[PDB]
Structures are given as C-alpha cells and as structure tokens.
Amino acid sequence: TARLLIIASIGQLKTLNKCEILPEERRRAELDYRKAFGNEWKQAGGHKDPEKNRLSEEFLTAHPRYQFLCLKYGAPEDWELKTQQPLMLKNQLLTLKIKYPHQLDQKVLEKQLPGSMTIQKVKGLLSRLLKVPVSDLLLSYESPKKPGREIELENDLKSLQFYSVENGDCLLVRW
Amino acid sequence: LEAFGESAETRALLGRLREVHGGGAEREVALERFRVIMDKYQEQPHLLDPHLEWMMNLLLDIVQDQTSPASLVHLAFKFLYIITKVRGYKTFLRLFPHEVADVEPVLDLVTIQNPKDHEAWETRYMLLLWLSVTCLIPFDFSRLDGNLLTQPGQARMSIMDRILQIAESYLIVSDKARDAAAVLVSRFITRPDVKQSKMAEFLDWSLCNLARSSFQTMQGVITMDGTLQALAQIFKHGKREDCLPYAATVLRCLDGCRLPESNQTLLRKLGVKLVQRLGLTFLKPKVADVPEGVERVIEQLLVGLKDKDTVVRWSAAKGIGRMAGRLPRALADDVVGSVLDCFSFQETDKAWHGGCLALAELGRRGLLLPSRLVDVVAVILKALTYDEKRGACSVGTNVRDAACYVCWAFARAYEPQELKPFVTAISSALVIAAVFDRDINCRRAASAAFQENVGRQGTFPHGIDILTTADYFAVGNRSNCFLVISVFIAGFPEYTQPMIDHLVTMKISHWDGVIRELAARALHNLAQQAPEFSATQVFPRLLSMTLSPDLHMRHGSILACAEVAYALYKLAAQENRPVTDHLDEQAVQGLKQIHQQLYDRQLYRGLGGQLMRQAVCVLIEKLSLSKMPFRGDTVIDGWQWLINDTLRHLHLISSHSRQQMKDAAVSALAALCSEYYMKEPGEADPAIQEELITQYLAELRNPEEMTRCGFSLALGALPGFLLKGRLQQVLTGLRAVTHTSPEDVSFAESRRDGLKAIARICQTVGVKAGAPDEAVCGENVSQIYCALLGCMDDYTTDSRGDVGTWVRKAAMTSLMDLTLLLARSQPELIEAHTCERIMCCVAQQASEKIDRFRAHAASVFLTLLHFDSPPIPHVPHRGELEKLFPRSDVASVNWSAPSQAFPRITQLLGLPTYRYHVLLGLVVSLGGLTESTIRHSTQSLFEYMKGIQSDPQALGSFSGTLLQIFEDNLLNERVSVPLLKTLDHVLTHGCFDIFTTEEDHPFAVKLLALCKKEIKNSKDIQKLLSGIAVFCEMVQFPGDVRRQALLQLCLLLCHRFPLIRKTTASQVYETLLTYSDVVGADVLDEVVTVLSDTAWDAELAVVREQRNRLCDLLGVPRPQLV
Amino acid sequence: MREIVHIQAGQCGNQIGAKFWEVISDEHGIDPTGTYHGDSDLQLDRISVYYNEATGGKYVPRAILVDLEPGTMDSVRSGPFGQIFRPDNFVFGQSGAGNNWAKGHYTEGAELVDSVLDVVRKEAESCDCLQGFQLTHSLGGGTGSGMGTLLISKIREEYPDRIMNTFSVVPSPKVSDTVVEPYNATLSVHQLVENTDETYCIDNEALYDICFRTLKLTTPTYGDLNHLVSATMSGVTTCLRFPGQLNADLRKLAVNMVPFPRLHFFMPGFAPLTSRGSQQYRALTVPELTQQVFDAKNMMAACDPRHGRYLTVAAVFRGRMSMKEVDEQMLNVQNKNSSYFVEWIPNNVKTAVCDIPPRGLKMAVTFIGNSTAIQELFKRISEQFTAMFRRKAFLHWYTGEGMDEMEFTEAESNMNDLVSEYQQYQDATAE
C-alpha cells in the first residue's frame, strides 16, 4: 500500500527497489493514489468545475502530484468517495403491508421483515398469527411500481430479495 | 395438416392491427404470433392457397386507405412480406391487383420511401414487387401520363422515367430491396415501349457499373451482384431478337471484369449465370451459323464445373445442359466428350460432382448418344462407390448423390432396347447402393432412382418385388437395410455375389468401426443364402485380408471371418454335421495362425492394440462357440494367454473402451473354458483346473485395481463343472477382496466386480443340498449373504465423489440374483432375519437423493416383491407393500423423478420395521443440497405427517425414531447437517405442535442436548448455521428448554466469525417476530431496537456489551470466560 | 494473432449473434459502414480476433449465417449492421425443418452441410492462426439445434485440433408452446456431450423470470431476452476482445474451466442487470458487483449455484478499477474471520481487469461457473422425456425419417449417466 504511493510521488521513477516498473504498475499505483486521496481533495476545496477549483496550500504541499492526476484520469466522482461504512440489521428490514382479499373489513397490518427471510418463515408466521395451516396459505405480492400485476410465491426455499421485493411492497394472503 | 385450422385466430390478429400499431410490446407480440402461426406450413404452404386472397385483401385495405398513418402501413407491409416468404412471391404476386388504376397509386407510394430507413425494409420490398406486378398492363406508359406540359415552369417527369430512376437507385442498395429491384427491371425493360426508350440507357448504366465496380470495395461488390442479377433476369425473361444485338458487348465486358479469379462465390455464380444466359441468345430454341462467341461461352461454362463450391458447380451444370439442348447433334458429342474429361485421375473429387451434374442435365433432355453408353456408364459405376478419407474427414457424399441423380435421369435418356446392354451392371449398382450406402440421403436418392427406372422402363430383374419392400420409408433405418432388406434382396440369384463382393471389398476396409461391425453382422446373415460361395470364395478372401498391413482392414476381415464361421456352424448344427464340412483343411489351418501372426508382428501395441485384441477375442469366442477341432493343439494355450495378458493390461486400454474389452475377454474365456477344458463328460482337466485357478487367485492381490476388476469377472464366468471341488477357495478369495482394508480404501471397482462375480458363480453351480465345495448349500449360503450385506454400507467419499455408491449397485443386482435363485431351488435357505435385512437395505437405497441409483433400487424392490413362482417367504407386511404398489400402477412409474417416488416411498413410515431405515434414508434427501429433491421430499413428508400429527402415540414414535437415528449417527458429518436441516424444516412447519402445550417434554429435553453435543466445537459454517436454525426453531417449546436455547443463541451471537454473529441476530429477529408468547410486551420494543441498531459485524468486544444487554432483557444468565 | 470463426444457426442463434455483433460494434468503435471511428488504442489491440483486414481499413466480421428458410436471413441482412456481413456468408434453404430434429439433422441439414462447409473453409483459410469455433443456437427447435450439432460434428471430424464453443439456449414452456421441444433438447445434449468442449447454458426460463420480475415488464418479448444474452456474451468475451494481464487464451481457459470432459457445462451471469433503452442508472462498487454477479437472480440459468458445488469459477470485471481491489475483495470474502464472509464463492476465482466498460454503464462484471447445480436443468427436461417416450407420442415423425428408438434410448441413458456423475461428484470432499 505504501509502494504504490512512492511511485505516485515521483513521475520518472522507472525502477524501485531493483524492480522494473510497467505501464500496468504505473496505472495501478496512480488509481490507488486518487482512490485514497479523493476524499481529502473534496474537503480541501476541490470541485470538478475547471473554474471553481480552489484548493488550500497544505493539501498541495502534501499532494503536489494530485493535480496532474486530476487531468490524467479526470477528477473523482461523488459515488467514488463513499466506501467507509458497514451495514446494520436496521438497513436489511423491509416494511410491507398485510392484506386479505377475502376479508376486506380487517385493518391494514404492517410488519418489518429481513431481506434474506425465506418464504417458509413468513408462511409460518402467518400460520401462527391467523391460525391457518401452512399448506393452506398461498402467498403473492404487489409493488407501487407494478400495479394490478400479481406474482406468485410458489417456491418456499427462496428469499424475498430473490423475488425482487423492495420497501413499500404489499403482501396478499389467501386461504 | 389437411386444412388451415387457425382462420379465426389469424383474422382476429389481422383485425387487431388498427388498434396495436401504436404499441411497442403488443406489436412485437402480434408479429411473433403471426410468424409462429405461418411457419407451421413452411414445409407445405400449398395448403394455405385457398386463404391467400382474403388475408392479402385484409392487409391491402389497411395500406390502400388515405387515412392510414405510416406506422400502421408499415405493420401491414410486414405482414404482407411474412405471407410472401412462406408462399413465395412468384406464386403470391399473381393475386395482387393489376388494374390500370394501380400504376400511379403504387409509383407515388414508391416515391415516399426512406432508403436510409433500415427498420422499414419490408415496406420497400413489398413496394418494388407491387410496382413490378403492375408493368404487365397491356398499354403504353405514355397513354397514362396524358399531358406533361400542364405544369408551367417545371414539367412533370414521365411514369417510365420515374421507374427507370427507381430501379437504378434500388439496384445499388445493401438491404433486401435490391433483390426486389431485380424482379422489377425484369418486367420493365422487357416491354415494347421501354425497350425502344430506355434499353440503351440501362445497358450503358450496367456496362458502366461493371466497368467501374470492384469485388474488394463493399459497395463495389454490392454494385456488381445487382448488375449481374439484373442482366441475367433480363436475358432470361427477354425476347431473343431484341437481346442478341447486345450479347457481343456484354460478354466482352464480363470477360474483362475478371470474375473467376475474384474471391466471391455469389459473384462467380451470377457471372456463370449471365454467361449461360448470353450463350442461348446465339442459338435457336429446339423442341425435342454457330457464332464464335459460343466457343468462348462453352470454354467458360466447362471451367465452372471445377469450382470450389457446389453453388457454382450446379449453375455450370445447368448452363451446360441448357446449351447442349440448343446446339446441333454434332457439337453435342464434342461437348459431352469435353465434359467427360472432368473424371480424370488427376482431377479432384470436386470436379466429379460437376461432371455428374452435367451428365444428369444432359441425360434429362435426351442428348447423350448410344455410343456414349460404354464410357459414361463405366464412370457411374465408380461414382456410386466414391467414398474416400482425406486426412481426418471423409468425402464422397455429393459424388454419390450426383451419381444417383444421373442414374435417375437414364430412365428417359435411352430406349428400353438402347439401355438393354447395361441392366445387369446398373440394377446391381442401384440396389447395392440403396442397401449398403452410409448416408440416408444417398440411400433414398438410390431408392427414388430405382423406382423411376422400374416405373418408366421396367426391365430390371424383379423391379416391382424390390420396390415394394425397399420403399422410401423402408430404407430409413440403416440397421434395417443391412440385416433385413439385404437378405430379402439376396434371396434372388441376381443380387447375391455382387453385394457380397462389394461388402467384402469396400465396407470391410472402411474407416468407421460401427460401419465395419454392421457389415460383418450383415454378412453373418447373408452367408445363409449362399453357404458354398461364402465358404469357398469369401473365406479365402477374408483370410488373406487378416494378413494385410492395414489395421482397419485386418479388423474388418477378422470380424467377417468370425461371423462367417459362426454362421456356418449354426447352419451345420441344423443337419447335425461338423463345421469342418464347409471349411477345408487349408481354411481351418489358417484359423489356427491368425493370433500367432499378430503376436509375432507385435500388432498388439499402440492405439490399434485394443482393436486387434477386441477382434481376436471376438474371433476366439465365435470359434469356441462352434466346437472347432483345436482340442489338444497348442494353439489353445495361445488363445488363453492372450486373455490373461488383457486382464493384466486393462489399465493400458483407453477409458472409452475398457469395459467392452473386459466384457469381450470374459466372454471369450467363458466360451473357451466350456469347450477346450473338459477331460470327460462332467469332469475337467486336473492340471489346467489347478493352474488357472491358482494363477487367478494369486492375481487378486495385485495392488493394481483394473487387474483385480478383470480377474473378478473372469472368476465370475467360469463354468460349473470346473468348480465341482474348488468353490470353498474361490468364494473365500472373492470375499477377501470385498473387504475394505487400510490400503484398499479407494478400491471400489474391485469389490463392485467381486460382487458381480459371486452372483454369476452362485447362479452357475446352483443349489445342491449337501455338497459345499461343489454348489451353494446350507453350509456356504450364510457366508455369501454376509459378504453381500457388508458391501451395502459402502459410503466411501473421496475427491472422485461418492464412488462407493457404485458398489451398492453391485449389491442390489447381486443380492437379487441370489434370492431369486434360492426361491427357485431351496426356498428354506432364505432366512427371515436375512430377508428382512435385505428388504430394509433395499428400502434405504430406494429413499436416497441420487436419481439413477434410487430408480435402480425401486425396480429391484418391485422385482423382489412381485415374485410369486414361488412367493419369497418371510416378507414383513407383504400384503401392505403389495397394496401400496399394485402391479397395474407399477407399469407406469417414474421412480427416477422425485415427484413420482417420494410420495410413494414416504408411506412406508407406517410400517414399524421399515419406519426406522426409510427415515434414515430419506433424511439425506430432506437435508441434501438438490432443491427439487428437497422440495419433493419435504412435501411428501408433510403429506404423511398431516395424518399423524394429532396422535400423541404416532407422533411420539416418529420423534423417537428420528432421535434414535440422530443418536446412532452422532458426530457423523454425513448425517449431522442433513438431519439438522430436516429437524429445522419440521419445526418450521409446526408438526410437533402438540408437545409445545406442556413444559419440558422428553423429546426436546434430549434433542437439545444432542444438538449441543453435535455443535460443540464446530468450525464448519454450514453446520453452525444448521445448529443456529435448530436452536432458533426449538424456542417454541416452553420450560427450561426455552431458556437454554436463549442462552445458546446469546453464546452464538458472539462467535469468532462476524458472518455467524450477523446470521444469529437475523434469525433471532425472525424467531421473536414469530413466537410472541416467548417475550412479554413490556420488554419487546427494547429487543428489536438493540438488534436493528447494534452492528453485530463490528468489534466483538463492543458487541459483547450489547449481547450481554440482550441477556439482561431475555432474562438469560450472562456467561463468562472459563 | 488468434482468429476465431463465429457461427450462428437457427432463428434464435442468428438473432443472438446479430445482437452480440451490434453490441460489440459500439464497444470496439466500428461504425456500421465498416470503418473504425474509435478513439482508443486498446480497441484495435485485438480487433483481428473477430474482424478481418480488408482494403481501405474496412473491418469485416467473421460470422457465418446458416438456416433452412430465408425469413430470418433477410431480416438480419437489412438490420442496422447488415452491411458489414458479406453477402456470400448467408447460407439458406426454403422448407425449413418443422421443429423436427430428424428433418434438420439427417435430411435438409446434411443436404446444406456441403454449402455451409464451403463457406466455413473459405473463412478458415483466411486466418493466420485459427484458435477455435463458436456457435450460437437453441435446443428447442429442429433446424437450429440439428444443424448446430451436425456442423459441430463435421468441424470436429475435419479439425480435431480445434476448440468448440456452443452458447446453446434451453427452451422453456413459458416461452414456447411446442410439444416436441423435449425430444430435440435430449438429442442435442447427447450430441454435445460427445462432441463439445465448452457449453454455456443459457436457460430461457431464468431470462423470462428476470424480464418479468426484475425489469418489471408486463409482456416481455424476445427483444428483452436477446439483449440480456448479448450483454452476457459481451461480458464473457471481454478478455478475448481486449488486452489484459490475465491469460486471455481460449484453449488455456477451456482447459482450466474443463477439469471434467463430461461436466463442461458452464452457467453464465452478469451484474448490474439492465433492460432496453434505460441503461444508465448508477455505478455499483466492487463489493456490490461481486455480490450481485454471484446471486442466483443474475444467473442466466434457472439453477442456483448455491445448490451444488463449485468446480471452477471465472470472473471478469470491466470499468475503472485496479486488480488490487478485486484481489483484496476476493481474499476477504473467503476469510472466515472477516466482516465480509459469504457462503457462495469458492477459494479460487480467475479474476480479470479491463478498462473498457460496456455502453451505458461505467462498471460491469461477468461470472462463469462450472457448478454441479446445472444438473437440475438436465433433470427438468428428462422428466418430460418420460411423459412422451413412454406413450410414443409424435414418434412417427422421427421414425418415419430414419431415426430409431435405439437412438432415443441411448440419448436417455447418456443424460442419466451425466446426471448421475454430476450428483456423485457433488458429494466429493473439499480438500
């Protein structure tokens, strides 16, 4: 990780530690230097606009070979400086609404299910709730994106994410 | 297909055009629907002839309306084009309109077309053809224009002028519209007025196009092809006195264009076409003074037969045939003589196809003279047998096709008396080919020619008799032509010696092994219709071919000799005479030198060594099955040796021909031992019986695997009279191999073959009650059953997969072969415990997850259960099994399909004795990896659990059996994860909903401890996930088990692997969302938030606090570091 | 300079080939006129592998169109890129086959095989170093699959030292309503198991499900299936069409991905999944792309790699990324003690890097797996073979042409043996 920076600090370094350097090596080291120092370039007052680029002096003294790379392979985008956060269970849950075409007088129930939840567990939950057998509960869904187009959930070993389920969908239970 | 049974659908689809032309998804759907409906009649579109008009008019009232938008008009023209590709334009355009009021409406539509619009090419195609069907009008284009000086300032352009400017522009395009431009000019320049007005202009344009264009620039080649096609069509559909004036300049330009040397197949074909179109303009049409250009045309068309492509050869042949039909009878002989030069020795096979095509074209018109019969025929006899190998590929198919075509064209080229001299060489050729030809196209090509010959002429020997049997459909299967129809044809004396000669000469020396085997099997039957000719003429022939340097020829000749010997022995066996009556001393003397002439030339090495070994083994088997007179002669000692060496070098044989080699060697050994190793009636030779048996037994311990595999089957093929007092040793030697030793761990094929060998030996000797070392008796029957059952638990799993399963297969076919034997001799030997164990093992091997072994097991079970003569005694719930699998339903069952097997196998749980094994076998499928098998097994298991869920007794016994199976396979990696997954599924389905009522059930109290002991110190990710799921499903049981499961779920939440940490929380969330009574509502909004906010994949030290906090909420004691 | 002769038989095969050619024409930088207006040196670095060198710098494809009817041959000739193809590269007949394997393999197929081999040899002779042959066709039709198998056998007999690739397409009831599609599917599989080196299984049931659910299409047509197939094909041959540090050889790739000569069937996948028209959505990172490409949802086959065993895996990325990132990701995925551990990626993936992403996307990834789960597909059609062969339904169409019930039994036995070998090797120790 440091070697790539050294080659990125010198422009005519064709050999380092008794090892020849190729265009592939030069490009790898130049892409790593931009991937590592993009975030700081935004905070230092950087912007892709060729007339709104106003960087400070400390960032230039620490990275005096970052402006040439900005023109060699363009400036880093906003979608390239957001890779430093992990995931939580809160960010895997899907808020859906439970409906019953046979019983419309019932209230609109809402639940939160994981993304990797199999259809078997959902069927078991519905059976334990409505007290209906598992073999007598068929499952479908509808999305605000595709209205009036019902899909079937005949396979039980699959997950909700495989069926392209997303936040905001609505499940329909029949028996 | 008798009629169009989709009229309403097509009508509705056509009517929906006016309300689907604004759609992009529905438009494509309707197009794809119209295409699949019309493609059904692509092989016989004539059935749609009665409908053409109505559909055409429908599509026309949409493109012939003034309120029609461009998009709607484009779909109608696409449909119109779809009907012109299936019926074709030449036949579908005759119904289009042709009234004088359709000349300007169609030319004006042609003048609003976008040439750069590639999406609307069908529109332009349909436009040009319509404009061309409107140039037939019998009036001058001048009468239609009326007055051109009506528009002051700018005069209107004439209709004929516009059409000339439309054709010239479309004749240089790169889409399919250029082909529609070729059909337009053909009906534009070939009329009177246009001929006098624009013919010179169009000719100058074409001569300029072929004077500036090239075959290298892409657009240049586009300009060349279109111009050549237009010129060819004009010269074809053009008057001969308006054209002949321009034939001199067209050929002079084509000669300078240099087409033969150009690297384009289409350009050369069109060029040859244009050359043959100009050639007939110089001669007068005949109905059956030679300018100099005719010689140049012939010299060009005789060089178009040696082309490298068949598309040009066919055109050259057609041109030669059309030219010969117009020239006088004198030049016809010279043309035929020049065309015959294509069949020279230096000429390649490509030149032969063109020559035969030209000969057929000449014969179709009846131009060949009688003097050309002794020569032309002499060539055809060879063209029908053209089949050479040029390196790695074969050639001769097109040659034989053209030969059959020429033969089919001789039924009208000569009188019945003119061709009377060659009805003995051509009838033999046709028949021979139609019978032995390799390709099916040639065979049916020879079948049609013979039919035409016997129909028109009818002078061939037995024409109707040979045509009735060898018909178009009878010669479909090649196997039927070699073994059946061949004998029927040989029944007559006119098709016996020639066919046998053709088979022994070429087919025996063929390059394909299957063809050689088929020819040998055909000669086997043909020898019956001619024993003397096959014993006095064919046998010396094949015997001399066994000494050939060619490997394939040697193999074929050896096979032919063996088959002829077997046929002669079978034929002689009828009259009760020796086989030596047919073969002479010299013949039986040469059958004792084949193997010594091969072993002395070292012809058993290399890739041909296996083929030579196979041939010699087949020959030895056929000679031993005939009782030949080689007893006492040392030659026998040779044959035997050649067998042993094979069993010693099986690993040298390729992996694609070792099983067949071993089987053939075993069969030869069996045929030899039961013929040349018998001292007296019922006894055997003491020296050989001892030496062979000792050698084979000592060979079983060779560390090599293939050697043991071969010697096993060798022992399993010896006769019964040679084991009258050595069974106690052979059985022990075979059982010593069936055992799995530390060194023979991955040696499964050896035991698989030993089991099969024990089956065969037990079947041969039979049962004799009292004689242990002679036959299967009540003393050596238990040991056999114990050795066979010890190979049923072979679950050896290596880097090659579950190879042990193979052995299990040998245990299902072997154990059967023994049982069925005892019932047919001494049923008392079939003990009750042994039969019950065999049945339970068969049940377990029929409830497996693999589909081909499971299917084999069910068939064996049905065969063992459907045995009534006599009925196998001691069958648990025999009546129950019989009612569950009735004989009527077994006739159609897909045991290999899990759907048609698991619901029928799950019912066996009802029987106590089967309930345990059947479940142990079904656990692997319920917890395997196959998705379809898992689904089917789970469905079939729930369908049976639904019948005993409300029964405390049945459900309790089922749970006890499941837990006993789990305990018996404790710490077993092959049964731990699958059974855990099965338990997880059963718990998720809610089958044990009755035990969840009370507290602390004897079932879960020990199931949880067993799961803990199974998952204690486990690194496998799949095992950890299965354990977590089981511990997250077992929470439904209240009592101390719930608190212990919660403590385990808290312990697992803080595992070494962050993936496990996340999965445990993800599953605990679902478990809490499912069962609400496990946690009260006072501490429920405190658990979900901690599980959703806490990042279980972060630092473990930080997650320990959150995890410990979830132990103070759930009420679980907080563990510590021991 | 390794040249590969492209081939495409049947309507579906011709359409897939035309779509793939039109897709790669925009990536290489060759206008439909037949010239190169590309501005990248990397484009012309390996253009000879699929294009010939003619006068005036005009690039001519190496494709060979073949059919038994002319309709589809005419549609491609007038397509957007119908001029680059040579006029004499179009071989066709008139009657077709009729959804019958015997009529498209033994009669019309063997009748037009001569004219097809003519052009095949004419094209092969114009190559400095021929590497192998590629064919695009289907398995639910007569002409297509029949002529495909016949041409494969002929090229194997005449050129045993050449590699063979077949992007066969498996039919599905949800796309076609023909009853004799199982028989033709079983015969083509039997022929390919004997005369093939690589077979990219492209199920027509997975593509339909993707177009219906993922793309959220009301009534998907062949245009939503051919685009996906062409995208997957372009993603597969990314190394064979552009430079790369990884070995981009076809023979070595097949040898590494064909450890078993009967289990040479490969399931192909590609993320992110896009439709027609709308393709510029966002730029997914390397982790997201690797998670989506190995997902059963982005699989062109109806089988899930998770339900089996990973024998060989080949991954190819394209966009603006360094090999170090892919290596670190792939090494951390298999690390059981890391925070990014999964359970559907083996411990050895042949990763590749490229700097030429497809059109409308900044980054893309392709995956090819020799997993045993493909056996499930082989069992999906087999069941149908039992619901017809036992009843002898439509058997007079095959026996009347020349075929024997002995050919059907042999094909069924071969399929059963293949399935058994797959299921047996699926239970091998992971040492």
Ligand SMILES: Nc1nc2c(ncn2[C@@H]2O[C@H](COP(=O)(O)OP(=O)(O)OP(=O)(O)O)[C@@H](O)[C@H]2O)c(=O)[nH]1
């Ligand atoms: N994905 C896809 N499948 C197609 C397409 N066209 C046809 N198919 C499938 O191909 C199978 C057989 O049809 P084709 O390949 O068109 O037929 P052919 O191979 O030309 O054979 P013949 O009709 O006998 O001449 C069917 O199962 C169709 O569903 C296509 O464009 N895309």
Ligand SMILES: [Mg+2]
């Ligand atoms: Mg078709």
